[PDB]
Amino acid sequence: MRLFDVKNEDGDVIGHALAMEGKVMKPLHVKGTIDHPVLSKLKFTKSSAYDMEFAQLPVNMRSEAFTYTSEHPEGFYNWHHGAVQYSGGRFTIPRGVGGRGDSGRPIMDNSGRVVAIVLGGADEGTRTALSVVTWNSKGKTIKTTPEGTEEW
């Protein structure tokens, strides 16, 4: 398992945490408990500048973890709800698809590698532009956020 639910007290899924490159990562804005006995007990380092927090995965979950890539050429990508378009510096999905609870979900290329983590989105034009976290070829973290983004 490399994707885990983040839940509130009533067991409602409010976001997601993911296992990637030796770390468990989740949007900082999602205040809930990761639905896993070990992951919910780890010490997380916060990074409010990129709306995220992480902890080191136990060595045994490392094999199960997602791989990340800075390679995100223009085109179409994959995510839980279908296709995600990457065009003109923007990841977009159809209107009426994403919403609260989808933060923490990865966007993946066809090889299954993660190219971005969803934080929220904003309706722009006839579609919805996504606020996301990525890392460039230099390993630099980048949070890209459309104006009037709603946290998911």
The number of folded domains in the chain is: 2
3-class SS at 98?
Answer: coil
CA distances from 93 to 23, 127, 130, 149 (A): 27, 6, 8, 14
Within this chain, do residues 71 and 118 fall inside the same structural domain, yes or no?
yes
What gap in Å lies between CA 128 and CA 124, rounded to an integer? Answer: 5
Distance CA 73, CA 134 (A): 13
- The partner residues of 79 in beta bridges, in order of sequence, read 82
- Return the CATH number at 115: 2.40.10.10
- Same domain? 96 vs 82: yes
**72 noted as active-site residue:** no
Q: Catalytic annotation on 103?
A: yes
Cα(28)–Cα(133) distance, integer angstroms = 12
> Are 71 and 116 within one domain?
yes
Please give the residue range of the domain that contains residue 31. Answer: 2-66
> Are 61 and 71 members of one domain?
no
Q: What is the resolution of this structure in A?
A: 2.0
53 with 107, same domain: the answer is no
Tokens coding 72: 């995100």
d(CA 142, CA 132): 8
Catalytic, out of 16, 102, 103, 131: 103
Inter-residue contact 106 to 66 (CB < 8 Å): yes
Other beta carbons less than 10 A from residue 74's beta carbon: 10
Take residue 113 and report the two structure tokens written for it.
């590698």
